[PDB]
Ligand binder design. Structure first.
Ligand SMILES: NC(=S)c1ccc[n+]([C@@H]2O[C@H](COP(=O)([O-])OP(=O)(O)OC[C@H]3O[C@@H](n4cnc5c(N)ncnc54)[C@H](OP(=O)(O)O)[C@@H]3O)[C@@H](O)[C@H]2O)c1
Ligand SMILES: C[C@H](O)[C@H](O)C1=Nc2c(nc(N)[nH]c2=O)NC1
Ligand SMILES: [Ca+2]
Length: 186
């Protein structure tokens, strides 16, 4: 595939989850951002693909599965078949990448988004391919049991601006956050 996109929300301690959920209570606007970025294809007749770990998949309320308007691919070394509602199951990122290139998919897919968790982000980060990381930095700390892997600031250059991404510090529910885009060129 040409390039990857990863999206995540992190707090000050780099936590991304706690007890099978997000460490903070609901933020409406941040959520809509994720929906908008992951769902928006720039080609008619094509849809985006989202890739995610098993834990992540099960974290989404069942009635909300699969994420509407995207091809959901779950990764698992243990499952035998895609969980009820997922489009495809893959045993590794590589496998997932190959499937995407498959003829049946290739023409059906616009963008590939990596939606975590940890191991998923890590794996994608290490692929020597063009990659854009969309980070929402929540400017507070919350107790977390799961964390975002360390990004190589030598590879991933923070962009100072990106089309459609608000620049300023945002606030909602008394919480401040900022959007940042990092880009790796291969
Ligand atoms: N802040 C944001 S935006 C965000 C985004 C995603 C998740 N979360 C949170 O983080 C937690 C879920 O994340 P996590 O890191 O614990 O779990 P996940 O990555 O979602 O799930 C882990 C499992 O997925 C499979 N897997 C993961 N990476 C794999 C790979 N490269 N190849 C094959 N299978 C792989 C394995 O399943 P098997 O054991 O079956 O092999 C592994 O046990 C929840 O609290 C969720 O809310 C937060
Ligand atoms: C995909 C699943 O809902 C998951 O927890 C994710 N949540 C978010 C995300 N990305 C952002 N920006 N915000 C979220 O709430 N990526 C993944
Ligand atoms: Ca396991």
């Amino acid at each position: 595939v040409r390039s990857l996109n990863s999206i995540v929300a992190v707090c000050q301690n780099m936590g991304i989850g706690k007890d099978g959920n997000l460490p903070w209570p609901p933020l409406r606007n941040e959520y809509k951002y994720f929906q908008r970025m992951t769902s928006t294809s720039h080609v008619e007749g094509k849809q985006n693909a989202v890739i995610m770990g098993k834990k992540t998949w099960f974290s989404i309320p069942e009635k909300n599965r699969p994420l509407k308007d995207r091809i959901n691919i779950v990764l698992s070394r243990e499952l035998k078949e895609a969980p009820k509602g997922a489009h495809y199951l893959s045993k590794s990122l590589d496998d997932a990448l190959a499937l995407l290139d498959s003829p049946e998919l290739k023409s059906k897919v616009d963008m590939v988004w990596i939606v975590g968790g940890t191991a998923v982000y890590k794996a994608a980060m290490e692929k020597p391919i063009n990659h854009r990381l969309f980070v929402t930095r929540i400017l507070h700390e919350f107790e977390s049991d799961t964390f975002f892997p360390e990004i190589d600031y030598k590879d991933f250059k923070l962009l100072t601006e990106y089309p459609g991404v608000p620049a300023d510090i945002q606030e909602e529910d008394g919480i401040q956050y900022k959007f940042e885009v990092y880009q790796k060129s291969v």
